[PDB]
């Protein structure tokens, strides 16, 4: 129909792109928080593996 | 003189480093561990462990766990909540409660692989 | 899924069940301790 409708659609897509750009960084931060919570449980797993091993032997 | 001691739970550590003496509420009488103790594994009771450190003193409350002792090292596999049978059973029944559904089926349902393959190709086009 | 790297998430399946010179002093009994520890170990690998 005309240039007005296309102009509104380019503005519509530009708004969504800025929040999806922010959410990638927000996700990277949360990924780093879940990776330290992964390392704070290894000691309870590696030592009990040894105890259950010797106790069976 | 000084024995290495670590208080550890499934979610995170609670304490670490060298200590002079460790006092713990075991299953059958209290224990006093000092450097060089003989190998001992013991079930703990809900209560505090006192750690004497070269003279200062530390205290931490624990809800259960396993005390592993060696001459060189002392490991405390500390639990994060009370493991009482009523609590233990309650959370299992809540899982069964939610698990219940209107279409349980026979248990031999299959061939849904086509749907997962159709979506996998769309996911390739997306990236 | 397993965190192979920031760009890789490997889907995987592993078996939870079924799984020196000195000896430990056991309180109250070795069987009681093995039964308790095995439960702590399976609940731990599920949380991991």
Q: Which residues does residue B43 pair with via DSSP β-bridges, in sequence order?
A: B66
The secondary structure of C10-45 as a DSSP string is: E------S----S--EEES-HHHHHHHHHHHHHHHH
Name A54's Cβ contacts closer than 8 Å, sequence gap at least 6. C20, C24
Residue B56 C-alpha, separation from nearest chain C C-alpha, in angstroms: 29
- Answer whether C48 sits within 8 Å of A41, measured CB to CB: yes
Question: How far is residue B83's CA from residue B89's CA, in Å, rounded to a whole number?
Answer: 10
Q: How many residues does chain A have?
A: 57
In chain A, helix, strand, coil percent, each to 5?
90, 0, 10
Q: How is residue B78 annotated by DSSP?
A: E
Q: Is residue B5 exposed (0-12), middle (13-18) or buried (19+ Cβ within 10 Å)? A: buried
For B97, the enclosing helix (H) or strand (E) is helix B85-99
> Is residue C24 a contact partner of residue B40, using CB atoms and an 8 Å limit?
yes
Q: Using what technique was this structure determined?
A: cryo-EM
Two tokens, residue B46:
């809900």
Question: How far is residue A25's CA from residue A27's CA, in Å, rounded to a whole number?
Answer: 5
List the single residue in C20, C45, C48 with the smallest CB-CB distance to A54.
C20
> Is residue B48 a contact partner of residue B59, using CB atoms and an 8 Å limit?
yes
- Closest residue in C to B78 (Cα–Cα): C40
Going by their DSSP bridges, the two strands B47-52 and B21-24 should be labelled as antiparallel
């Amino acid at each position: 129909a005309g240039a007005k409708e296309i102009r509104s659609k380019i503005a519509s897509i530009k708004s969504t792109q800025k929040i999806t750009n922010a959410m990638e960084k927000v996700a990277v931060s949360k990924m780093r928080k879940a990776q330290m919570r992964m390392a704070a449980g290894r000691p309870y797993a590696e030592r009990i593996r040894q105890v259950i091993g010797h106790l069976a032997n | 003189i000084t024995v290495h001691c670590d208080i550890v739970s499934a979610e995170a550590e609670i304490f670490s480093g060298l200590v002079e003496m460790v006092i713990a509420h075991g299953a059958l009488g209290d224990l006093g561990i000092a450097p060089g103790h003989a190998p001992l594994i013991t079930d703990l009771k809900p209560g505090p462990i006192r750690l004497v450190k070269q003279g200062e003193q530390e205290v931490y409350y624990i809800s259960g766990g396993f005390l592993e002792v060696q001459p060189n090292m002392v490991k405390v596999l500390a639990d994060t909540v009370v493991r009482a049978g009523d609590l233990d059973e309650a959370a299992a029944q809540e899982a069964l409660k939610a698990a219940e559904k209107a279409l349980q089926g026979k248990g031999a349902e299959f061939d849904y692989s086509a749907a997962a393959a159709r979506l996998a190709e769309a996911a390739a086009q997306l990236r | 899924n397993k965190f192979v790297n920031t760009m890789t998430q490997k889907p995987t399946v592993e078996q939870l069940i079924p799984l020196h010179h000195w000896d430990y002093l056991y309180e109250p009994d070795a069987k009681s301790l093995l039964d308790g520890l095995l439960v702590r170990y399976v609940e731990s690998q599920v949380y991991q």
